[PDB]
Ligand binder design. Structure first.
Ligand SMILES: *[C@@H]1O[C@H](CO)[C@@H](O)[C@H](O)[C@H]1NC(C)=O
Ligand SMILES: *[C@@H]1O[C@H](CO)[C@@H](O)[C@H](O)[C@H]1NC(C)=O
Ligand SMILES: *[C@@H]1O[C@H](CO)[C@@H](O)[C@H](O)[C@H]1NC(C)=O
Ligand SMILES: [Zn+2]
Ligand SMILES: [Zn+2]
Ligand SMILES: [Zn+2]
Length: 155
């Protein structure tokens, strides 16, 4: 129902800018959605962006999203479904990845989402991810990966 964050961590400006691949989550949401790709342009400490994401039934759908940042959390809102909307606590930041925990409609119990800079990361990265997850009461064990985009290091 809850992890154990860094004592602060906070964030940094323009840190979530650019393009990320959401390939690992706990719980695994990858039966429902797949090939999640997300581009972020930074309006100050906030950001707007688009989240492209293939469903089983329907095609490659995008979503308009805005992140209203405020310390070590942010309000994720998407103008479309309003289903993954929630305050999200940043749990780790890095060059190649960042991790967020939150309690959307979809996973009120709690949802952890790992974004990656590259669609298939090298094993170096995955290990730092491992580290970060442990540092905050979590493990790759309970994290499901998006197989729909093969990556050997996410197996
Ligand atoms: C994932 O999206 C990218 C967007 O260009 C595309 O190249 C790739 O083939 C996609 N695969 C899907 C929709 O599963
Ligand atoms: C994000 O979108 C919501 C949608 O209602 C809005 O209330 C909020 O002020 C927006 N923040 C911006 C524009 O960064
Ligand atoms: C996700 O990938 C990691 C390796 O990167 C692995 O340890 C983990 O068990 C995988 N989870 C599933 C269920 O795919
Ligand atoms: Zn919580
Ligand atoms: Zn979608
Ligand atoms: Zn493989």
């Amino acid at each position: 129902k809850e992890p154990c964050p860094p004592e602060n961590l906070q964030l940094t400006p323009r840190a979530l800018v650019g393009k990320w691949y959401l390939r690992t989550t706990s719980p695994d949401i990858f039966k429902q959605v797949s090939n999640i790709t997300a581009f972020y342009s930074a309006h100050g400490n906030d950001y707007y962006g688009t989240v492209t994401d293939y469903s089983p039934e329907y095609g490659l759908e995008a979503h308009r999203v805005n992140l209203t940042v405020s310390g070590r959390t942010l309000k994720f809102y998407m103008n479309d479904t309003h289903e993954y909307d929630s305050e999200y606590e940043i749990l780790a930041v890095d060059k190649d990845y960042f991790i967020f925990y939150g309690h959307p409609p979809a996973a009120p119990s709690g949802l952890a989402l790992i974004h990656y800079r590259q669609s298939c990361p090298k094993e170096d990265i995955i290990k730092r991810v491992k580290k970060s997850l442990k540092n905050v009461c979590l493990d790759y064990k309970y994290f499901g990966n998006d197989t729909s985009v093969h990556c050997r290091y996410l197996e």
